[PDB]
Amino acid sequence: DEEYGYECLD
Amino acid sequence: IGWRREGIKYRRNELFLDVLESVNLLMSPQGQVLSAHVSGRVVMKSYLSGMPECKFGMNDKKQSIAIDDCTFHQCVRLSRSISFIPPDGEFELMRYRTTKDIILPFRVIPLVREVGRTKLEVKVVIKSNFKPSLLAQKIEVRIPTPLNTSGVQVICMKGKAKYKASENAIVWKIKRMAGMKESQISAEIELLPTNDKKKWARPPISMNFEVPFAPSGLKVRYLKVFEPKLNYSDHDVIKWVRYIGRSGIYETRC
């Protein structure tokens, strides 16, 4: 696993 | 514009940014930072309609970083911060270097005690230095052992460790560790008799790890898309960031 990758960017 | 063609369209205008850094550290046995630095690059993958002009904003100049130097993809217009029409697809937006205010993700603390001429008692503590809610992963601590080593015992409550004879090291692997935590390994290193005079020149203990943030401090503040002809705007673009901080040379003298 990881998960990561990606986060939302405003 | 020789890096991007004219008829590009997507119904999902979407973009992804990758802040890739490797943190390099050389630390003395009692904890002075002897050398340190981050090399970073930002990679963008864009799927955006038409010929969009983009603006990358980060925390350069309460979370705020110092770029000693950096270089740009051909599409960045030099003159006062960062502007471009990006190539379609994946490309390297910039490359940079940092030395001031680095977040060192780990402290390594070695203890080595010579027990007669027969044994070395080694203790090594690692401290995670970052938010509690974040996890490092792929942690590897590598402790070197001398040439006259006949065998090794180890105990570690977290992760798994093996002595690798052919490499003269004890390798300690930990799958994941949260911020603000501490863990130790203990080892006895058993020695063959050796020629008394010449003494062990101790190599440093090295680590590897990956952390889900930028050791330099860099935060992506925004990625602005203005495309003056097509009927989508900045709010229509779906945007993602990911931070991957990995060790470079990360060494603690012992």
Q: Is the same domain home to B80 and B133?
A: no
Q: Is the same domain home to B3 and B80?
A: yes
Residue B235 DSSP SS3: helix
- Nearest residue in chain B measured CA to CA from A6: B242
User: Method of determination?
Assistant: X-ray
CB B224 within 8 A of CB B150: no
> Range of B223's domain?
1-103+211-249
Q: Which residues of B214-237 are buried (b: 16+ CB within 10 A; e: fewer)?
A: bbbbbbbeebebebeeeebebeeb
Q: Is the same domain home to B98 and B139?
A: no
Separation CA B174–CA B177 (nearest Å):
7
The residue behind tokens 């692997």 is B173
Q: Which residues of A touch B241 (CB under 8 A)?
A: 6-7, 9
Q: What is the largest CA-CA distance in chain A?
A: 26
Question: Resolution of the coordinates in A?
Answer: 2.5
Q: Which residues of B touch A5 (CB under 8 A)?
A: 212, 242, 244
Q: Is the same domain home to B112 and B206?
A: yes
Q: Is the same domain home to B3 and B42?
A: yes
Q: Is the same domain home to B229 and B180?
A: no
Q: Is the same domain home to B127 and B93?
A: no
Please give the torsion angle defined by the CA atoms of residues B224, B242, B220 and B251, in that order, rounded to the nearest 10 degrees: -150
Instruction: Assign residue B172 the CATH number of its domain.
Output: 2.60.40.1170
Class of residue B134 by CB neighbours under 10 A (exposed 0-12, middle 13-18, buried 19+): middle
Q: Measuring CA to CA, which residue among B82, B60, B63 is closest to residue B71?
A: B82
Map B180-233 to HEC letters.
CCEEEEEEEEEECCCCCCCCCCCCCEEEEEEECCCCCCCCEEEEEEECCCCCCC
DSSP for residue B234 = G
Q: Is the same domain home to B26 and B93?
A: yes
- Pairing status of strand B182-191 against strand B69-72: unpaired
Tally the domains of chain B. 2
